[PDB]
C-alpha cells in the first residue's frame, strides 16, 4: 500500500555556501541517479525507494565570514584575487559547533524532519507507508544530524541507517573530546562516506577505537566492475577477526552497528592537488550523481 | 652601569609541524642566526646601539603535537607510516592551535611558558651581561609560541613588557574561537605594543586588527618596507591615529572607542613581502620555509629596531 525505504535528506549545502530550490535540484539528482541504478541492477526494488529534500541551515556561513574578515587580503575586493588564498576549511566547523546558536540549530533540523516526515505520510505516495526511514546528510548537515541523533527523549520516528556525505564530522568530535575529555547515534548504523582527496574527510572509528587508526578504512568498490558489491564483508566482526592482534568483545558494544562506519570512496589522486577554494564544491555535488553511492545504499537496503 | 639597554626574550615553540620533542640546541640555533641578523642590521645602520642589544632564548612546548597526531589518527591515510607517504594528503593546519588551546591541560602549557620567561629572565639578571641591567623587555614568540606568551601577557611575569612581537602566529583564529565559544575587552595583553607580522602566503597567518574593531577589514595592514629598499622604513606612520584620519570616512563617537579599546598607539597586523608564486606551494612545506624566514629576514630585524630606537 506503498513504498519501502524513506530517505530524509539533511541537506545543508556545501560548506562554503554562505537556494532551497536547489536543494531539490540535488535531491532530483540523486533520486533519478537511484532509479537509474536501480532499474538496471536492482529491479526487484524499481519504484521502491523514496526521496525527500530536508532543508538544513549553513551553519557554517558565520565562520566562514569571520574567517575571510581575518585573512591578510581581507581588504581585497577581487575575488580572482582571493581564489588563491589558504581557506582554513577545517576550523569551519569548529567554529560553527562552537557558536551559541549551534544548538538552535540542531533543534531546527529535528524541526524540519518531523515535519518532512510528516509531509511524506499525509502524501499519496506515503499513504500507508511502514518501512525502514534512513537519514542522509551531506557534509555540515551530516553533524546537525548526528547530534539530533544523540539527543533526548524529539525524532517522530526510529531512523534505521544514517549516511554522511564527505563530512568533517569525526573532527567536530575531535574537539568535544579535547574539550571534555572524561566520555551513541539513535541509528542501526552509521556509514562515514569520503573521498580521501577531501580536506573535509575525518574517519569516526579510531574515535570508538583507537587501535583502528592502523586499520584501512573499508573501500568502496567501483560502480562498473562490481554493482552488487565484491563478496568483502562490511561486517566489524570479521574485520575484528583479520585483526586478531587486538578485548575484542569490549569493541562489539561501544560501536555504531554492526557493520565498519569509515568507508572509501574511489577518487583520482589529482583532486588533492586542486586550489583549496575550488574542492568544497566539487565533492558536494559529486555525492549527488555518484554511481558508487547510490550502488553501495541500494546494496544496504535490500537487506 | 650595564650596557644592554633592551633585552628580548624569544618564545620558541618550533614549527608547528613537529609532533616530536623539542630540541633546545636547534632553537639557540635560530636564536643565533636572529642576532647575527641584528647585528649585521645594527653594524651597519644603527651603530648607536651596538652591543647594546640582547636576545635570549625560551624553549616553549610544542603544544599542537598531540593535536597533530589526533588528526593524523584520523585521517583517510592513518594506517600508512611512512613521512614521505603521508607529506602530501591534506593538513588541516587551521584545526591544530584551535585543538591545542581547547585542551583542559593548555593552561599548564601557558605556566611553563611563564615559569621558563622568569627563569630566562632571571638568569640574565645574574650573567655577567645582565648584571645591572635596568632596560626594557621586549618579547618575540614564533607562531605557536606567539599565542602562547599572549596568553601569558593577558593576565605572573616578573617583568614589565614594552613591545611583543609575532612571527607568523595563527593566534587571531584562536581567539575568533574564544569570541566564538562565549561572546561576552578581557584579553587586553599587558604590554606597551603588540605586532602581529605575517607574510601573507603563510597558511597561518590571520590578522588581529578585525577582532578589535570589525571594518579594519577593510583596511590593508600595515606593510613592513623591504631592507634592500628602505633600510630606515619609507618614512610611513605606524599611528593608530593616523589610520583612522586616513579612513575617516567608514566612522561616522566610534573613534574615540577604537583609541582606547586598542592594544597600544601603533597598529598590529603587518605584512612581510611574500612572492605570490609561494601560495601555490604543497602546505606541507611552507611551516618550515615560513618558521626558518624569520631568524635571518633583514626586513623583520631593521622593523624591530627601529621599534625599540
Partial sequence: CAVHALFLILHSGNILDSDANSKQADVQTLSSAFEAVTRI??????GHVALRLVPCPPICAAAYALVSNLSPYSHDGDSLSRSQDHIPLAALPLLATS?????????TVIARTNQAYSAFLRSPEGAGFCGQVALIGDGVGGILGFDALCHSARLDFKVSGFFLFGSPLGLVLALRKTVMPALRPA?????????????CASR??????????AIAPLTVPRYQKFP???????????????????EVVKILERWWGTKRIDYS?????ALTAFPTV????????????????VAFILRQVIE
Fill in 41 to 46: 541492477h536492482f529491479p526487484e526494488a524499481l
Fill in 99 to 107: 557558536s551559541s546558536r549551534y544548538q538552535g540549530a540542531v533543534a
Fill in 187 to 199: 541509528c542501526e548504523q552509521i556509514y562515514n562516506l569520503f573521498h580521501a582527496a577531501d580536506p
Fill in 204 to 213: 569516526l572509528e579510531p574515535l570508538l577505537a583507537p587501535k583502528f587508526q
Fill in 228 to 246: 552488487l558489491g565484491d563478496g568483502s564483508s562490511l561486517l566489524l566482526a570479521d574485520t575484528l577477526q583479520t585483526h586478531s592482534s587486538l
Fill in 265 to 269: 570512496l574511489y577518487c583520482p589522486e
Fill in 278 to 293: 575550488t574542492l568544497p564544491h566539487l565533492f558536494h555535488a559529486s555525492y549527488w550523481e555518484s554511481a558508487d553511492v
